[PDB]
């Protein structure tokens with residue numbers, strides 16, 4: 001009853017889109033079994049995301065914190081909603097995402113991208129179907145594990161299948177917790193719970209190896225794990241460390257994979273844009289196998305294509321803030337203690353904010369084009385924006401540039417362009433393609 005006065009009805013994000021269009025900038029919805037208010041004016045996005053006064057609503061992150069009674073991300077960087085506790089860990093972990101830190105990762109990005117392209121080139125017979133979703137997820141995982149933890153997962157070589165299965169089931173668990181046959185319930189619970197335990201045990205094992213390497217005086221390059229450890233200096237137990245281990249293990253590859261998959265999917269029906277991209281990579285990097293850091297800024301058209309991919313297909317569709325006190329938002333009285341839902345997915349597909357919103361047009365992000373003002377936020381905005389944004393943008397440019405340099409992709413007929421909402425948004429189908437060398 002406290003929300004019944006708010007406009008509203010008498011993937012789920014498309015239903016929200018329809019309702020925002022019909023009912024306006026402030027609409028009551030039910031999401032993850034709780035009443036929320038979707039706020040879609042740019043004035044609101046600015047007000048709430050650009051102030052440290054407004055913090056995340058913990059209740060809407062419960063499925064990341066713990067699933068079926070197993071601690072998952074716990075109080076790591078994404079799911080910690082207390083400002084002071086978040087701030088302390090953010091400032092320490094930020095050191096691993098410095099300009100100098102990120103420049104040193106180019107070798108890893110290049111090596112894993114080159115490995116992917118070589119594997120794909122051997123299958124480029126115009127006939128063999130290849131799941132680009134799977135290949136790009138393995139590439140993202142292998143990049144993350146090496147870059148962040150000094151670990152070789154070698155998923156591109158077909159290694160670590162138990163780990164890959166663990167990740168899949170954990171993501172299914174997050175999804176089931178936020179939605180949802182007795183025999184079905186039993187096996188599901190068992191497999192999800194054991195997968196989460198496996199992931200934290202991977203953390204424990206790798207932290208032990210790192211500590212042992214340091215004690216023996218071995219060479220350990222400073223990385224994300226260094227700063228995750230530094231954040232926990234003098235903690236009473238290792239649960240905080242393992243929260244962030246798992247947070248970065250998953251966050252550091254899943255969304256990047258989703259974004260790569262969506263971009264490959266969309267480009268399969270954009271032959272003219274693909275031709276322009278091919279020309280750009282040919283002109284900027286030539287025959288070089290390796291992209292230098294300075295080359296990345298020169299791939300201007302690719303940058304624009306990637307921005308446009310995130311407008312229509314943001315893997316993380318939005319964020320929540322807790323409204324503590326009753327507040328008038330765009331003419332609507334919103335009671336205190338209410339989760340406010342912000343969605344870059346919904347705003348990206350609204351004609352009020354983007355002309356011909358379903359048209360894929362990289363020119364929207366061109367040098368002379370007016371920039372979206374608080375209508376576009378695939379990495380979010382403000383203090384709780386993505387710590388990995390520049391890491392992600394670099395890795396995906398490296399991977400895409402090397403694909404475009406060497407291969408042509410055709411989507412297998414019957415493959416769909418639709419989305420599914422699991423723990424993130426991702427393509428519904430495996431992005432099955434046939435390949436030829438350029």
Ligand code: HEM
Nearest residue numbers: 077078251252255256259316319378379380386387388392
């Ligand atoms: C295209 C790739 C990526 C997209 C679209 C993306 C998107 C986002 C979004 C929308 C948020 C805000 C989430 C929220 O408010 O609940 C976020 C936060 C975060 N992301 Fe990313 N992300 C990407 C890549 C990465 C990578 C590569 C890493 C780590 C290496 C990463 C680690 C994080 C962490 C730790 C947070 C929490 C930040 C904080 O609250 O201080 N993400 N991401």
Ligand SMILES: O=C(c1cnc2c(-c3cnco3)cc(C(F)(F)F)cn12)N1[C@@H]2CC[C@H]1COC2
Nearest residue numbers: 060250251252254255316317318319320423424
């Ligand atoms: O679950 C998330 C969320 C947000 N960010 C992430 C990331 C992430 C960020 N950067 C890299 O990865 C990874 C995942 C994971 F499932 F893959 F683990 C989930 N999330 N939520 C958003 C939208 C609905 C829900 C609650 O509100 C805010």
